[PDB]
PDB file of all heavy atoms in Angstrom:
ATOM      1  N   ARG A  13     -10.511  11.511  -2.601  1.00 13.82           N
ATOM      2  CA  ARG A  13      -9.463  12.156  -3.426  1.00 13.82           C
ATOM      3  C   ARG A  13      -8.123  12.066  -2.681  1.00 13.82           C
ATOM      4  O   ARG A  13      -7.117  11.706  -3.324  1.00 13.82           O
ATOM      5  CB  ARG A  13      -9.843  13.596  -3.775  1.00 13.82           C
ATOM      6  CG  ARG A  13      -8.994  14.210  -4.878  1.00 13.82           C
ATOM      7  CD  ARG A  13      -8.629  15.672  -4.626  1.00 13.82           C
ATOM      8  NE  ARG A  13      -7.800  16.276  -5.665  1.00 13.82           N
ATOM      9  CZ  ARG A  13      -6.482  16.076  -5.840  1.00 13.82           C
ATOM     10  NH1 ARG A  13      -5.803  15.239  -5.068  1.00 13.82           N
ATOM     11  NH2 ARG A  13      -5.848  16.706  -6.818  1.00 13.82           N
ATOM     12  N   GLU A  14      -8.102  12.363  -1.378  1.00 12.45           N
ATOM     13  CA  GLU A  14      -6.876  12.358  -0.539  1.00 12.45           C
ATOM     14  C   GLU A  14      -6.331  10.926  -0.394  1.00 12.45           C
ATOM     15  O   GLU A  14      -5.116  10.753  -0.541  1.00 12.45           O
ATOM     16  CB  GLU A  14      -7.169  12.953   0.837  1.00 12.45           C
ATOM     17  CG  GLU A  14      -6.841  14.425   0.924  1.00 12.45           C
ATOM     18  CD  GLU A  14      -5.350  14.686   1.049  1.00 12.45           C
ATOM     19  OE1 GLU A  14      -4.748  14.283   2.086  1.00 12.45           O
ATOM     20  OE2 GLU A  14      -4.793  15.281   0.122  1.00 12.45           O
ATOM     21  N   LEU A  15      -7.202   9.961  -0.119  1.00 15.43           N
ATOM     22  CA  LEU A  15      -6.845   8.541   0.076  1.00 15.43           C
ATOM     23  C   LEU A  15      -6.243   7.972  -1.219  1.00 15.43           C
ATOM     24  O   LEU A  15      -5.173   7.333  -1.152  1.00 15.43           O
ATOM     25  CB  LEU A  15      -8.088   7.771   0.544  1.00 15.43           C
ATOM     26  CG  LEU A  15      -8.568   8.132   1.947  1.00 15.43           C
ATOM     27  CD1 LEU A  15      -9.974   7.669   2.188  1.00 15.43           C
ATOM     28  CD2 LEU A  15      -7.658   7.573   3.028  1.00 15.43           C
ATOM     29  N   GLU A  16      -6.878   8.215  -2.365  1.00 14.26           N
ATOM     30  CA  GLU A  16      -6.434   7.626  -3.657  1.00 14.26           C
ATOM     31  C   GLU A  16      -5.113   8.272  -4.070  1.00 14.26           C
ATOM     32  O   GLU A  16      -4.252   7.568  -4.643  1.00 14.26           O
ATOM     33  CB  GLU A  16      -7.504   7.800  -4.754  1.00 14.26           C
ATOM     34  CG  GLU A  16      -8.768   6.991  -4.500  1.00 14.26           C
ATOM     35  CD  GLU A  16      -8.659   5.480  -4.692  1.00 14.26           C
ATOM     36  OE1 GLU A  16      -7.543   4.994  -5.016  1.00 14.26           O
ATOM     37  OE2 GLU A  16      -9.694   4.780  -4.521  1.00 14.26           O
ATOM     38  N   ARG A  17      -4.946   9.562  -3.779  1.00 13.72           N
ATOM     39  CA  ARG A  17      -3.694  10.274  -4.118  1.00 13.72           C
ATOM     40  C   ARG A  17      -2.546   9.603  -3.349  1.00 13.72           C
ATOM     41  O   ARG A  17      -1.529   9.241  -3.982  1.00 13.72           O
ATOM     42  CB  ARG A  17      -3.752  11.773  -3.810  1.00 13.72           C
ATOM     43  CG  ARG A  17      -2.656  12.539  -4.542  1.00 13.72           C
ATOM     44  CD  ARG A  17      -2.376  13.944  -4.042  1.00 13.72           C
ATOM     45  NE  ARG A  17      -2.055  13.935  -2.623  1.00 13.72           N
ATOM     46  CZ  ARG A  17      -2.736  14.584  -1.680  1.00 13.72           C
ATOM     47  NH1 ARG A  17      -3.779  15.336  -2.002  1.00 13.72           N
ATOM     48  NH2 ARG A  17      -2.361  14.488  -0.414  1.00 13.72           N
ATOM     49  N   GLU A  18      -2.695   9.426  -2.039  1.00 12.80           N
ATOM     50  CA  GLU A  18      -1.675   8.724  -1.217  1.00 12.80           C
ATOM     51  C   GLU A  18      -1.511   7.285  -1.721  1.00 12.80           C
ATOM     52  O   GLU A  18      -0.352   6.876  -1.924  1.00 12.80           O
ATOM     53  CB  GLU A  18      -2.015   8.792   0.271  1.00 12.80           C
ATOM     54  CG  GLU A  18      -1.416  10.031   0.903  1.00 12.80           C
ATOM     55  CD  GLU A  18       0.090  10.199   0.708  1.00 12.80           C
ATOM     56  OE1 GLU A  18       0.807   9.150   0.656  1.00 12.80           O
ATOM     57  OE2 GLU A  18       0.549  11.372   0.594  1.00 12.80           O
ATOM     58  N   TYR A  19      -2.604   6.562  -1.969  1.00 12.59           N
ATOM     59  CA  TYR A  19      -2.520   5.148  -2.405  1.00 12.59           C
ATOM     60  C   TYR A  19      -1.691   5.056  -3.690  1.00 12.59           C
ATOM     61  O   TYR A  19      -0.822   4.174  -3.772  1.00 12.59           O
ATOM     62  CB  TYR A  19      -3.874   4.497  -2.637  1.00 12.59           C
ATOM     63  CG  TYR A  19      -3.737   3.028  -2.938  1.00 12.59           C
ATOM     64  CD1 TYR A  19      -3.569   2.104  -1.932  1.00 12.59           C
ATOM     65  CD2 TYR A  19      -3.756   2.566  -4.233  1.00 12.59           C
ATOM     66  CE1 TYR A  19      -3.456   0.754  -2.197  1.00 12.59           C
ATOM     67  CE2 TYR A  19      -3.644   1.221  -4.514  1.00 12.59           C
ATOM     68  CZ  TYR A  19      -3.487   0.308  -3.497  1.00 12.59           C
ATOM     69  OH  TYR A  19      -3.368  -1.013  -3.788  1.00 12.59           O
ATOM     70  N   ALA A  20      -1.952   5.947  -4.653  1.00 12.79           N
ATOM     71  CA  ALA A  20      -1.159   6.045  -5.899  1.00 12.79           C
ATOM     72  C   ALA A  20       0.325   6.290  -5.589  1.00 12.79           C
ATOM     73  O   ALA A  20       1.178   5.772  -6.324  1.00 12.79           O
ATOM     74  CB  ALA A  20      -1.697   7.133  -6.782  1.00 12.79           C
ATOM     75  N   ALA A  21       0.642   7.053  -4.544  1.00 12.63           N
ATOM     76  CA  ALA A  21       2.035   7.359  -4.136  1.00 12.63           C
ATOM     77  C   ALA A  21       2.664   6.131  -3.463  1.00 12.63           C
ATOM     78  O   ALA A  21       3.845   5.892  -3.673  1.00 12.63           O
ATOM     79  CB  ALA A  21       2.066   8.573  -3.223  1.00 12.63           C
ATOM     80  N   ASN A  22       1.903   5.381  -2.675  1.00 16.05           N
ATOM     81  CA  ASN A  22       2.431   4.216  -1.917  1.00 16.05           C
ATOM     82  C   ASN A  22       1.255   3.326  -1.517  1.00 16.05           C
ATOM     83  O   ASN A  22       0.270   3.867  -0.989  1.00 16.05           O
ATOM     84  CB  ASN A  22       3.231   4.688  -0.702  1.00 16.05           C
ATOM     85  CG  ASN A  22       4.139   3.628  -0.111  1.00 16.05           C
ATOM     86  OD1 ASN A  22       3.791   2.438  -0.015  1.00 16.05           O
ATOM     87  ND2 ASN A  22       5.302   4.063   0.346  1.00 16.05           N
ATOM     88  N   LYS A  23       1.328   2.033  -1.802  1.00 11.87           N
ATOM     89  CA  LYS A  23       0.260   1.046  -1.521  1.00 11.87           C
ATOM     90  C   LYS A  23       0.086   0.859  -0.012  1.00 11.87           C
ATOM     91  O   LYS A  23      -0.944   0.330   0.401  1.00 11.87           O
ATOM     92  CB  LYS A  23       0.604  -0.298  -2.165  1.00 11.87           C
ATOM     93  CG  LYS A  23       0.703  -0.310  -3.688  1.00 11.87           C
ATOM     94  CD  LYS A  23       0.898  -1.704  -4.282  1.00 11.87           C
ATOM     95  CE  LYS A  23       1.223  -1.695  -5.769  1.00 11.87           C
ATOM     96  NZ  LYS A  23       0.232  -0.928  -6.566  1.00 11.87           N
ATOM     97  N   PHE A  24       1.102   1.217   0.766  1.00 13.34           N
ATOM     98  CA  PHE A  24       1.169   1.012   2.231  1.00 13.34           C
ATOM     99  C   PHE A  24       1.329   2.364   2.942  1.00 13.34           C
ATOM    100  O   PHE A  24       2.268   3.090   2.646  1.00 13.34           O
ATOM    101  CB  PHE A  24       2.300   0.033   2.536  1.00 13.34           C
ATOM    102  CG  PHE A  24       2.000  -1.360   2.040  1.00 13.34           C
ATOM    103  CD1 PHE A  24       2.492  -1.810   0.820  1.00 13.34           C
ATOM    104  CD2 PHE A  24       1.224  -2.222   2.796  1.00 13.34           C
ATOM    105  CE1 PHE A  24       2.196  -3.091   0.386  1.00 13.34           C
ATOM    106  CE2 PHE A  24       0.914  -3.496   2.350  1.00 13.34           C
ATOM    107  CZ  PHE A  24       1.417  -3.936   1.159  1.00 13.34           C
ATOM    108  N   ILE A  25       0.432   2.695   3.866  1.00 17.79           N
ATOM    109  CA  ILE A  25       0.449   4.040   4.516  1.00 17.79           C
ATOM    110  C   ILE A  25       1.506   4.040   5.622  1.00 17.79           C
ATOM    111  O   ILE A  25       1.545   3.092   6.416  1.00 17.79           O
ATOM    112  CB  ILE A  25      -0.932   4.427   5.066  1.00 17.79           C
ATOM    113  CG1 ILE A  25      -1.003   5.928   5.369  1.00 17.79           C
ATOM    114  CG2 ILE A  25      -1.280   3.590   6.285  1.00 17.79           C
ATOM    115  CD1 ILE A  25      -0.773   6.813   4.183  1.00 17.79           C
ATOM    116  N   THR A  26       2.343   5.066   5.642  1.00 18.11           N
ATOM    117  CA  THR A  26       3.305   5.346   6.716  1.00 18.11           C
ATOM    118  C   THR A  26       2.551   6.038   7.870  1.00 18.11           C
ATOM    119  O   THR A  26       1.511   6.706   7.601  1.00 18.11           O
ATOM    120  CB  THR A  26       4.452   6.183   6.156  1.00 18.11           C
ATOM    121  OG1 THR A  26       3.896   7.459   5.828  1.00 18.11           O
ATOM    122  CG2 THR A  26       5.131   5.552   4.956  1.00 18.11           C
ATOM    123  N   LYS A  27       3.052   5.879   9.098  1.00 19.47           N
ATOM    124  CA  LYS A  27       2.512   6.507  10.331  1.00 19.47           C
ATOM    125  C   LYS A  27       2.386   8.013  10.100  1.00 19.47           C
ATOM    126  O   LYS A  27       1.355   8.557  10.485  1.00 19.47           O
ATOM    127  CB  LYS A  27       3.445   6.292  11.527  1.00 19.47           C
ATOM    128  CG  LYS A  27       3.615   4.865  12.023  1.00 19.47           C
ATOM    129  CD  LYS A  27       4.615   4.786  13.154  1.00 19.47           C
ATOM    130  CE  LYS A  27       4.981   3.364  13.506  1.00 19.47           C
ATOM    131  NZ  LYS A  27       3.827   2.574  14.008  1.00 19.47           N
ATOM    132  N   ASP A  28       3.414   8.632   9.514  1.00 16.65           N
ATOM    133  CA  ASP A  28       3.504  10.090   9.228  1.00 16.65           C
ATOM    134  C   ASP A  28       2.367  10.502   8.273  1.00 16.65           C
ATOM    135  O   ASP A  28       1.685  11.522   8.532  1.00 16.65           O
ATOM    136  CB  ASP A  28       4.876  10.421   8.617  1.00 16.65           C
ATOM    137  CG  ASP A  28       5.141  11.895   8.354  1.00 16.65           C
ATOM    138  OD1 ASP A  28       4.501  12.482   7.451  1.00 16.65           O
ATOM    139  OD2 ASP A  28       5.997  12.448   9.054  1.00 16.65           O
ATOM    140  N   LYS A  29       2.172   9.758   7.184  1.00 14.49           N
ATOM    141  CA  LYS A  29       1.151  10.095   6.155  1.00 14.49           C
ATOM    142  C   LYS A  29      -0.247   9.802   6.713  1.00 14.49           C
ATOM    143  O   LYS A  29      -1.200  10.538   6.350  1.00 14.49           O
ATOM    144  CB  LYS A  29       1.431   9.361   4.841  1.00 14.49           C
ATOM    145  CG  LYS A  29       2.209  10.181   3.816  1.00 14.49           C
ATOM    146  CD  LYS A  29       3.628  10.527   4.215  1.00 14.49           C
ATOM    147  CE  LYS A  29       4.684   9.581   3.667  1.00 14.49           C
ATOM    148  NZ  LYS A  29       4.583   9.412   2.194  1.00 14.49           N
ATOM    149  N   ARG A  30      -0.367   8.791   7.577  1.00 13.39           N
ATOM    150  CA  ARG A  30      -1.660   8.461   8.213  1.00 13.39           C
ATOM    151  C   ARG A  30      -2.147   9.659   9.061  1.00 13.39           C
ATOM    152  O   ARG A  30      -3.361  10.025   8.964  1.00 13.39           O
ATOM    153  CB  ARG A  30      -1.501   7.165   9.002  1.00 13.39           C
ATOM    154  CG  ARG A  30      -2.817   6.504   9.357  1.00 13.39           C
ATOM    155  CD  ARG A  30      -2.709   5.743  10.665  1.00 13.39           C
ATOM    156  NE  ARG A  30      -1.779   4.661  10.549  1.00 13.39           N
ATOM    157  CZ  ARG A  30      -0.928   4.263  11.483  1.00 13.39           C
ATOM    158  NH1 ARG A  30      -0.842   4.872  12.651  1.00 13.39           N
ATOM    159  NH2 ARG A  30      -0.129   3.255  11.224  1.00 13.39           N
ATOM    160  N   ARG A  31      -1.264  10.282   9.851  1.00 12.34           N
ATOM    161  CA  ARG A  31      -1.615  11.492  10.660  1.00 12.34           C
ATOM    162  C   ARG A  31      -2.037  12.644   9.726  1.00 12.34           C
ATOM    163  O   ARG A  31      -3.083  13.309   9.990  1.00 12.34           O
ATOM    164  CB  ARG A  31      -0.440  11.955  11.527  1.00 12.34           C
ATOM    165  CG  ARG A  31      -0.096  11.011  12.663  1.00 12.34           C
ATOM    166  CD  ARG A  31       1.022  11.515  13.556  1.00 12.34           C
ATOM    167  NE  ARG A  31       1.779  10.396  14.128  1.00 12.34           N
ATOM    168  CZ  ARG A  31       3.043  10.087  13.823  1.00 12.34           C
ATOM    169  NH1 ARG A  31       3.725  10.818  12.953  1.00 12.34           N
ATOM    170  NH2 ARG A  31       3.628   9.057  14.407  1.00 12.34           N
ATOM    171  N   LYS A  32      -1.248  12.877   8.671  1.00 10.61           N
ATOM    172  CA  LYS A  32      -1.511  13.941   7.669  1.00 10.61           C
ATOM    173  C   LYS A  32      -2.914  13.711   7.096  1.00 10.61           C
ATOM    174  O   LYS A  32      -3.767  14.609   7.238  1.00 10.61           O
ATOM    175  CB  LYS A  32      -0.473  13.935   6.545  1.00 10.61           C
ATOM    176  CG  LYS A  32       0.972  14.198   6.933  1.00 10.61           C
ATOM    177  CD  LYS A  32       1.209  15.181   8.049  1.00 10.61           C
ATOM    178  CE  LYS A  32       2.633  15.706   8.006  1.00 10.61           C
ATOM    179  NZ  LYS A  32       2.905  16.672   9.096  1.00 10.61           N
ATOM    180  N   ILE A  33      -3.166  12.525   6.538  1.00  7.85           N
ATOM    181  CA  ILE A  33      -4.507  12.181   5.983  1.00  7.85           C
ATOM    182  C   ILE A  33      -5.583  12.369   7.067  1.00  7.85           C
ATOM    183  O   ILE A  33      -6.653  12.962   6.712  1.00  7.85           O
ATOM    184  CB  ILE A  33      -4.557  10.774   5.383  1.00  7.85           C
ATOM    185  CG1 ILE A  33      -3.679  10.683   4.138  1.00  7.85           C
ATOM    186  CG2 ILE A  33      -5.996  10.373   5.078  1.00  7.85           C
ATOM    187  CD1 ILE A  33      -3.867   9.385   3.381  1.00  7.85           C
ATOM    188  N   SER A  34      -5.344  11.903   8.306  1.00  7.91           N
ATOM    189  CA  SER A  34      -6.323  12.058   9.418  1.00  7.91           C
ATOM    190  C   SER A  34      -6.679  13.542   9.599  1.00  7.91           C
ATOM    191  O   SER A  34      -7.903  13.871   9.612  1.00  7.91           O
ATOM    192  CB  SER A  34      -5.843  11.488  10.717  1.00  7.91           C
ATOM    193  OG  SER A  34      -6.933  11.441  11.637  1.00  7.91           O
ATOM    194  N   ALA A  35      -5.655  14.402   9.663  1.00  6.30           N
ATOM    195  CA  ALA A  35      -5.850  15.867   9.784  1.00  6.30           C
ATOM    196  C   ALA A  35      -6.606  16.387   8.552  1.00  6.30           C
ATOM    197  O   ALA A  35      -7.607  17.083   8.737  1.00  6.30           O
ATOM    198  CB  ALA A  35      -4.536  16.577   9.978  1.00  6.30           C
ATOM    199  N   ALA A  36      -6.177  16.048   7.340  1.00  4.43           N
ATOM    200  CA  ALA A  36      -6.782  16.580   6.095  1.00  4.43           C
ATOM    201  C   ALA A  36      -8.257  16.164   5.982  1.00  4.43           C
ATOM    202  O   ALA A  36      -9.045  16.971   5.473  1.00  4.43           O
ATOM    203  CB  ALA A  36      -6.011  16.117   4.884  1.00  4.43           C
ATOM    204  N   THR A  37      -8.618  14.945   6.407  1.00  5.37           N
ATOM    205  CA  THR A  37      -9.907  14.307   6.016  1.00  5.37           C
ATOM    206  C   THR A  37     -10.900  14.206   7.180  1.00  5.37           C
ATOM    207  O   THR A  37     -12.091  13.970   6.869  1.00  5.37           O
ATOM    208  CB  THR A  37      -9.678  12.894   5.477  1.00  5.37           C
ATOM    209  OG1 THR A  37      -9.119  12.106   6.527  1.00  5.37           O
ATOM    210  CG2 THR A  37      -8.780  12.885   4.261  1.00  5.37           C
ATOM    211  N   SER A  38     -10.430  14.276   8.445  1.00  4.35           N
ATOM    212  CA  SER A  38     -11.266  14.023   9.649  1.00  4.35           C
ATOM    213  C   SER A  38     -11.599  12.535   9.796  1.00  4.35           C
ATOM    214  O   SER A  38     -12.472  12.224  10.597  1.00  4.35           O
ATOM    215  CB  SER A  38     -12.556  14.829   9.636  1.00  4.35           C
ATOM    216  OG  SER A  38     -12.329  16.191   9.263  1.00  4.35           O
ATOM    217  N   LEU A  39     -10.950  11.628   9.064  1.00  4.27           N
ATOM    218  CA  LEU A  39     -11.093  10.173   9.312  1.00  4.27           C
ATOM    219  C   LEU A  39     -10.116   9.837  10.433  1.00  4.27           C
ATOM    220  O   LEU A  39      -9.081  10.520  10.523  1.00  4.27           O
ATOM    221  CB  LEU A  39     -10.752   9.391   8.045  1.00  4.27           C
ATOM    222  CG  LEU A  39     -11.635   9.656   6.823  1.00  4.27           C
ATOM    223  CD1 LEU A  39     -10.975   9.086   5.574  1.00  4.27           C
ATOM    224  CD2 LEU A  39     -12.996   9.035   7.018  1.00  4.27           C
ATOM    225  N   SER A  40     -10.426   8.826  11.241  1.00  2.00           N
ATOM    226  CA  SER A  40      -9.505   8.272  12.254  1.00  2.00           C
ATOM    227  C   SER A  40      -8.355   7.504  11.561  1.00  2.00           C
ATOM    228  O   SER A  40      -8.530   6.916  10.435  1.00  2.00           O
ATOM    229  CB  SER A  40     -10.229   7.392  13.245  1.00  2.00           C
ATOM    230  OG  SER A  40     -10.752   6.225  12.611  1.00  2.00           O
ATOM    231  N   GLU A  41      -7.211   7.498  12.242  1.00  3.14           N
ATOM    232  CA  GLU A  41      -6.023   6.699  11.883  1.00  3.14           C
ATOM    233  C   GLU A  41      -6.500   5.282  11.578  1.00  3.14           C
ATOM    234  O   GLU A  41      -6.099   4.737  10.504  1.00  3.14           O
ATOM    235  CB  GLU A  41      -5.010   6.789  13.016  1.00  3.14           C
ATOM    236  CG  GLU A  41      -4.447   8.185  13.153  1.00  3.14           C
ATOM    237  CD  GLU A  41      -3.007   8.262  13.616  1.00  3.14           C
ATOM    238  OE1 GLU A  41      -2.439   7.204  13.957  1.00  3.14           O
ATOM    239  OE2 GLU A  41      -2.450   9.375  13.609  1.00  3.14           O
ATOM    240  N   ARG A  42      -7.357   4.736  12.447  1.00  2.00           N
ATOM    241  CA  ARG A  42      -7.949   3.385  12.284  1.00  2.00           C
ATOM    242  C   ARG A  42      -8.647   3.318  10.910  1.00  2.00           C
ATOM    243  O   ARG A  42      -8.365   2.355  10.121  1.00  2.00           O
ATOM    244  CB  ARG A  42      -8.917   3.083  13.433  1.00  2.00           C
ATOM    245  CG  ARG A  42      -9.459   1.666  13.376  1.00  2.00           C
ATOM    246  CD  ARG A  42     -10.549   1.356  14.378  1.00  2.00           C
ATOM    247  NE  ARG A  42     -11.269   0.149  13.974  1.00  2.00           N
ATOM    248  CZ  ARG A  42     -10.901  -1.106  14.251  1.00  2.00           C
ATOM    249  NH1 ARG A  42      -9.795  -1.338  14.935  1.00  2.00           N
ATOM    250  NH2 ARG A  42     -11.642  -2.120  13.818  1.00  2.00           N
TER     251      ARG A  42
END
């Protein structure tokens, strides 16, 4: 849900949004 919401906002993840998603989801930046 978090990944698709960001993907819909921007096809390319920013460093800032990658950290946010990492914190929200427990997935690694990688």
Side-chain angles (χ1 to χ4, degrees):
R13 194 220 179 284
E14 265 283 295
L15 292 163
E16 293 288 1
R17 197 196 56 240
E18 271 306 327
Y19 186 81
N22 197 320
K23 297 186 189 307
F24 292 97
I25 196 60
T26 68
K27 294 177 190 297
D28 184 291
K29 264 66 96 53
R30 197 211 296 142
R31 291 183 210 112
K32 298 325 200 180
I33 293 189
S34 192
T37 63
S38 315
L39 298 166
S40 65
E41 293 213 354
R42 185 187 162 85

